[PDB]
Amino acid sequence: IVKKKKQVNEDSSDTVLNMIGGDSENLLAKWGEPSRIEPSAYGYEWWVYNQDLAQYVQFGVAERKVVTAYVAGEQVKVPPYYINEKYEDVYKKNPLSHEISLKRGKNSYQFELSDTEVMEQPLVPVEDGWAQLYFDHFTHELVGVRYMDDETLLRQRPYQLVYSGPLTPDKMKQIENGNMQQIFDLTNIIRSRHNLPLLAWDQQTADVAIGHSKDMKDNNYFSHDSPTLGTLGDRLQRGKVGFQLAGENIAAQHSDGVAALQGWLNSEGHRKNLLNEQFTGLGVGVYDKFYTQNFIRK
Numbered sequence: 001i002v003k004k005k006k007q008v009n010e011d012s013s014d015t016v017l018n019m020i021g022g023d024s025e026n027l028l029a030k031w032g033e034p035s036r037i038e039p040s041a042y043g044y045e046w047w048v049y050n051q052d053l054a055q056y057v058q059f060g061v062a063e064r065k066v067v068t069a070y071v072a073g074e075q076v077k078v079p080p081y082y083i084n085e086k087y088e089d090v091y092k093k094n095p096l097s098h099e100i101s102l103k104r105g106k107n108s109y110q111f112e113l114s115d116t117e118v119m120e121q122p123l124v125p126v127e128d129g130w131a132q133l134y135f136d137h138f139t140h141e142l143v144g145v146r147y148m149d150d151e152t153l154l155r156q157r158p159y160q161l162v163y164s165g166p167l168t169p170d171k172m173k174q175i176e177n178g179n180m181q182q183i184f185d186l187t188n189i190i191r192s193r194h195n196l197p198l199l200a201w202d203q204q205t206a207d208v209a210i211g212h213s214k215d216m217k218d219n220n221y222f223s224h225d226s227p228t229l230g231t232l233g234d235r236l237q238r239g240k241v242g243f244q245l246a247g248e249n250i251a252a253q254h255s256d257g258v259a260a261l262q263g264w265l266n267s268e269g270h271r272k273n274l275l276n277e278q279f280t281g282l283g284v285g286v287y288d289k290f291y292t293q294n295f296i297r298k
């Protein structure tokens with residue numbers, strides 16, 4: 001199927017960026033009811049629109065105001081850019097800075113981006129806010145856009161920050177569950193982008209992954225091998241998961257699942273698991289800021 005894209009009139013529909021700063025009633029009117037609503041670790045709730053992977057967007061709502069959004073769908077409008085745009089073309093239209101300065105009240109903040117951050121996830125100012133531009137540095141293409149107001153940027157802290165001067169355990173579990181499903185869906189966006197079959201969610205595998213994330217946090221290590229609970233294979237077997245093949249990606253300390261997954265996409269070893277056509281299933285387990293993907297073939 002090849003559709004005609006002919007156009008003679010400006011499209012009157014609001015963009016994701018146009019929603020930032022507007023109220024939730026406006027978001028509900030323009031976008032409809034989200035698929036899922038789940039808490040974040042930063043005071044906003046995510047309203048997730050994931051039923052069409054080509055249109056994937058999630059909006060963050062705090063006190064009935066839209067404060068952030070993350071765009072992953074290939075067809076979602078992100079002017080002056082487009083999802084898939086080459087880094088050289090993105091830069092040229094608005095050179096990307098290594099330093100970002102802002103103020104709240106009488107305090108001063110200066111983010112210092114590393115050379116890697118400038119190439120993988122630079123920041124550009126937008127009317128009343130910011131856009132974090134997530135790239136796949138191996139293909140040099142724009143793969144996501146995170147819009148944030150000033151308050152959200154300071155909470156997320158995506159880069160090193162120079163400046164002036166309470167979640168319950170059950171809320172934490174809800175936040176972790178959100179990070180797990182976002183990583184899952186956004187991994188399938190990557191699979192689709194790379195012409196690979198999508199992965200099926202496996203709950204028993206996800207439970208194994210959660211246990212690993214918790215073990216790393218509790219026992220102060222970061223490895224595929226648990227000093228007390230063994231290898232990936234040992235863990236999956238213990239969780240009653242049979243498999244023909246397995247793989248694992250681990251991450252720690254990223255702000256959220258979106259950030260962890262972009263770290264994996266931009267690392268050769270982790271990317272190999274994301275792009276392995278042999279895998280059929282995926283369970284994701286998150287415990288605080290420890291994120292684990294367990295991929296399986298069955």
Ligand SMILES: [Cl-]
Nearest residue numbers: 006007008009
């Ligand atoms: Cl038209």
Ligand SMILES: [Cl-]
Nearest residue numbers: 015075076077
């Ligand atoms: Cl759109």
Ligand SMILES: [Cl-]
Nearest residue numbers: 158254255259
């Ligand atoms: Cl991060």
Ligand SMILES: [Cl-]
Nearest residue numbers: 266267268269
């Ligand atoms: Cl690498």
